[PDB]
Design a protein around this ligand. Structure first.
Ligand SMILES: COc1ncnc(NS(=O)(=O)c2ccc(NCC3=Nc4c(nc(N)[nH]c4=O)NC3)cc2)c1OC
Ligand SMILES: COc1ncnc(NS(=O)(=O)c2ccc(NCC3=Nc4c(nc(N)[nH]c4=O)NC3)cc2)c1OC
Ligand SMILES: Nc1ncnc2c1ncn2[C@@H]1O[C@H](COP(=O)(O)OP(=O)(O)OP(=O)(O)O)[C@@H](O)[C@H]1O
Ligand SMILES: Nc1ncnc2c1ncn2[C@@H]1O[C@H](COP(=O)(O)OP(=O)(O)OP(=O)(O)O)[C@@H](O)[C@H]1O
Ligand SMILES: Nc1nc2c(c(=O)[nH]1)N=C(CO)CN2
Ligand SMILES: [Ca+2]
Ligand SMILES: [Mg+2]
Ligand SMILES: [Mg+2]
Ligand SMILES: [Mg+2]
Lengths: 529, 538
């Protein structure tokens, strides 16, 4: 069989929430099936290196290779046209009354939530839960929110010292042997916490908005939107304030919308690798947190791979390391860099439509890599003419969204996908402005944009060659300011120092010590006479 | 006719001025202000200028006129004053002399007022923006009816709907007189009391025109544009015939139309300030003011720089200073000559950054400047305030906050409530200029970044710039040291300029009226792009 398995992942260690939660994912890819959906990483309010190069192999092979549909997943969503459970089913009232009891028994730091959908070979929840629990020990808490359309309840189980073997044998080519049983007292599906823990309902809204379990009184979106709605008028809380969406560039947490990172452009396009590493160094000094390297006679690979090499050396010569992204659509170039640890991010200006296979290089059995998906049409010679859009803003958004869905169906972690509207690519000047005017449409999403030096900036101003050069750099800093206030996550610029300076001042003006001083100081003045 | 009473009394009167001529509003209204100053008494308060939505339902002969006015029989006194007792009495509104004209009571007043409204609404019901301004006059005219006569003369002089001047209040009087007819000779007699008459057919027109008299003016309570103006001047004031203070009335009016009508009465009733001779809508544009520091020998280089800065996009040049006079006047005199060699309203507004009466006197006499930028807020030599007023010319002024002088002011850094202390100071400086006849809408506020302010304090003043949302705001941050203190070998130079451009952006979003800058082209490029981003094509 193949079932649809919705897990919920967890951790506490901020410094390593990545390292941990990502490993939980490799295992889930290995031992239960294929990850076909993840959600955003979230921060919520209520040695391990070596381990990898030796672990028991799964009783199945992995399909690294791509897919565009999943019928089982699709059944699941609708749902319920699946073979009957291999375990005792339970009614509406049966479940409603039993759920309550489990809650009050348990009635008597930061949390990091990350749902997942799994195409699973495993036969049933219980069997799943065993495969899971074993997983936990090998290393963090991994629930099951759903298993097909099952309304399951089972109240007591003890299991063997060999049974554990025999289930964990059916799936895995194998002191912790018994360690599991005092914990596996229970199995509720849907999980009990499901309607109650907000972090959960928040991870689900990413993945399965339109879902509806029968033992649930509305859809996961209409459930989510009621939690948020009510927790505002009832308690007067804004619940998103303390539950913050995360995205990851290398290995660290980044809170969506809380910074505008500078991405320094290094464009190698007779030319001299020694300089290009000096320029990288400069850039780091000047404020850049990312360097975007690209070439695009002799080859892309020759222009880019050495320079990244010289760099990777000279950095060991001398951990505030610049994040490195490569501006490439070339599968092979990216394969090298990634096999050689030369880069952290793929900047793919074709949103990985040049060579969808490139997505495969974004995983290893231990490491994930983040990607910039950019929208364009055609190439630099034709794109100027490729300017008709039905609904400019939304067409580009939907394009990027579909594009993300694809990587995510192929187990590229959502939180590692960045969107880029691609300013100046198959856009008239007024269309580049309209996109900026409307950038709020990306408020839910990690956003990366590149306005720097582009022709449209010039157009908005209406020796004489060098005046326009200067005005163009100057005009850019307006867009940096705009970007700062619209809270764009990354901006791709040639002029780091000027950009950093501007972002520095803007940051200060905004750094308030006391958020009520404004109204307090006003009231004091009005009582002074 | 105890109307010609020998007795020299001092009254308080509140006037309303309106015109429909957008392109000439300043000149129309400022012409009226001059004639009010000339014929009625002392202007001791004014509101902002407003562009207002008509509330009917509830060009160059002026320059000749000003050359040919009859003399007032009352002296002009330009001396500065700090206080006006009659005005404080008016506001309170305690004991004043009795009304020469006969009063009605409230019940009676409201009946006759109310009457006139319905009647009037009807007339208009069966059937272009206003430019409004109110004024407080300390007046030597004996009574409202007498004042109205003189007002009507002024309205005639100003013709060949150009100007409407109404009496809103006069002391604490409640008056409603229904069928005035006034002898042609009585008009002459009243006019002659107050004016050396040297213009006869005019007195014929006036007899028709004065038919009743209502104090308060009938519309006072009914017309937004009128309450808008009053709220500026006398928010605390309460006439006996009014349910509440001007501010309560004003606030209620704004509330009512939000509920009963869902209107937002503010959107199309715009506050105006005035830099030279044209209308600026408050908060509608961030103007660049280019800095010219003559700190030299050679003026020709300075005038080229001036011309550069215009091309670079500055709409105001702020010039500052071997005499300060010797540094500055040549440059402005050269510039004026080099500009006249030349395209007529591409000329920058010129401000002179000076606290020195003698220097500003000479500039103004030789039509060299438009604006005084007085960094002491005219506290150094308030006599300079006399120089802001001519016979047919008002000059605008920037009032900036600081303490001490450049050697002292780095240790005068202690404030109880930085943001409001400074705001209160500027508000008091404005009250002083306004009490002394400077139009409220010609005065610009400047918090004085970097003067008797630690860096943190400069930032703090910028974080809370919102406090000046109701007022014309001028700031100068350019290249000051606080900017550098805010970020992590001309590096310092560049990073400093770069940081300025951040503050240009902030200024843009906070809708600061004027930013005073060294780097014009860079600043202009930034504001051009920000403007375009805001410009929705639909
Ligand atoms: C006739 O020739 C021309 N035809 C069209 N446009 C031209 N100029 S352009 O200024 O509008 C302009 C400049 C540079 C670009 N691309 C630079 C990049 N931009 C991005 C990137 N990656 C990501 N993720 N996002 C990016 O915006 N990589 C490279 C695009 C448009 C142009 O002149 C050079
Ligand atoms: C040890 O020396 C020093 N100590 C403290 N601060 C110094 N410099 S500073 O950066 O803070 C600075 C720079 C220039 C100024 N003044 C220039 C002006 N500023 C304005 C104006 N007019 C109007 N209306 N508004 C204005 O802000 N005119 C001139 C004030 C402070 C400083 O260096 C000379
Ligand atoms: N849907 C479910 N998925 C997993 N375990 C479940 C489920 N329903 C009931 N259980 C039981 O509840 C236990 C929960 O312990 P676990 O350490 O896995 O953390 P948890 O589910 O986050 O809850 P808690 O930390 O409060 O115990 C499981 O060991 C199992 O016996
Ligand atoms: N307090 C007052 N101030 C001015 N005019 C007054 C006052 N009380 C009564 N009036 C009378 O109202 C007349 C209105 O004439 P005016 O030329 O100002 O017309 P208007 O402004 O179009 O009038 P209204 O405001 O009544 O619609 C005056 O000529 C005068 O006779
Ligand atoms: N806003 C506004 N509306 C009016 C005004 C005026 O001055 N301002 N004057 C009127 C009659 O003269 C009629 N309506
Ligand atoms: Ca006078
Ligand atoms: Mg669990
Ligand atoms: Mg009139
Ligand atoms: Mg009138």
């Amino acid at each position: 069989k193949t079932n649809i398995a919705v897990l919920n992942l967890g951790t506490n260690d901020r410094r390593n929430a990545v390292l941990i939660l990502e490993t939980a994912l490799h295992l889930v890819e290995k031992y239960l099936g294929k990850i076909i959906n993840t959600s955003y990483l979230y921060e919520t309010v209520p040695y391990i290196n070596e381990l990898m190069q030796n672990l028991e192999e799964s009783k199945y092979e992995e399909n690294k290779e791509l897919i565009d549909k999943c019928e089982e997943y699709e059944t699941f969503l609708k749902n319920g046209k699946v073979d009957n459970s291999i375990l005792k089913e339970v009614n509406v009232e049966n479940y409603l009354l039993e759920c309550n009891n489990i809650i009050v028994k348990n009635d008597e730091s930061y949390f990091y939530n990350l749902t997942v959908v799994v195409k699973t070979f495993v036969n049933d929840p219980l069997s799943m839960l065993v495969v899971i629990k074993y997983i936990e020990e090998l290393m963090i808490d991994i629930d099951i929110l759903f298993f097909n359309d099952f309304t399951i309840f089972m109240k007591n189980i003890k299991l063997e010292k060999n049974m554990i073997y025999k289930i964990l044998s059916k799936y895995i080519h194998l002191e912790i042997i018994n360690n599991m049983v005092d914990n596996i007292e229970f199995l509720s599906i849907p999980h009990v916490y499901t309607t109650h823990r907000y972090s959960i309902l928040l991870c689900l809204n990413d993945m399965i908005p339109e879902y509806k379990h029968n033992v649930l009184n509305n859809t996961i979106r209409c459930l989510y939107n009621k939690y948020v709605s009510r927790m505002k008028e009832q308690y007067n809380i804004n619940i998103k304030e303390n539950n913050k969406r995360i995205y990851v560039l290398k290995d660290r947490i980044s809170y969506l919308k809380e910074k505008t990172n500078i991405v320094g452009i290094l464009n190698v396009n007779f030319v001299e690798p020694k300089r290009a590493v000096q320029r990288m160094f400069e850039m780091i000094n000047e404020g850049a947190s990312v360097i975007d390297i690209g070439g695009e006679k002799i080859s892309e690979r020759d222009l880019v791979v050495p320079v990244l090499q010289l760099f990777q050396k000279e950095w060991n010569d001398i951990d505030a390391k610049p994040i490195i992204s490569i501006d490439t659509i070339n599968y092979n170039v990216f394969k090298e860099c990634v096999d050689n640890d030369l880069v952290d991010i793929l900047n793919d200006i074709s949103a990985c439509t040049n060579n969808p296979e490139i997505i495969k290089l974004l995983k290893k059995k231990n490491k994930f890599y983040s990607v910039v998906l950019m929208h364009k049409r055609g190439n630099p010679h034709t794109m100027d003419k490729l300017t008709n859009y039905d609904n400019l803003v939304y067409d580009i958004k939907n394009y990027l969204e579909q594009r993300l869905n694809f990587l995510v169906l192929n187990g590229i972690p959502r939180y590692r996908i960045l969107f880029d509207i691609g300013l100046g690519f198959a856009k008239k000047h007024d269309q580049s402005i309209k996109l900026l005017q409307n950038i709020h449409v990306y408020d839910e999403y990690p956003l990366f944009i590149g306005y720097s030096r582009k022709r449209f900036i010039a157009h908005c101003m209406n020796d004489k060659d060098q005046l326009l050069y200067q005005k163009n750099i100057c005009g850019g800093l307006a867009i940096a300011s705009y970007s700062y206030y619209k809270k764009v996550d990354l901006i791709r610029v040639h002029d780091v120092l000027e950009t950093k300076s501007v972002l520095d001042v803007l940051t200060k003006i905004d750094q308030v010590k006391d958020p009520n001083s404004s109204s307090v100081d006003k009231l004091a003045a009005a009582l002074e006479h």
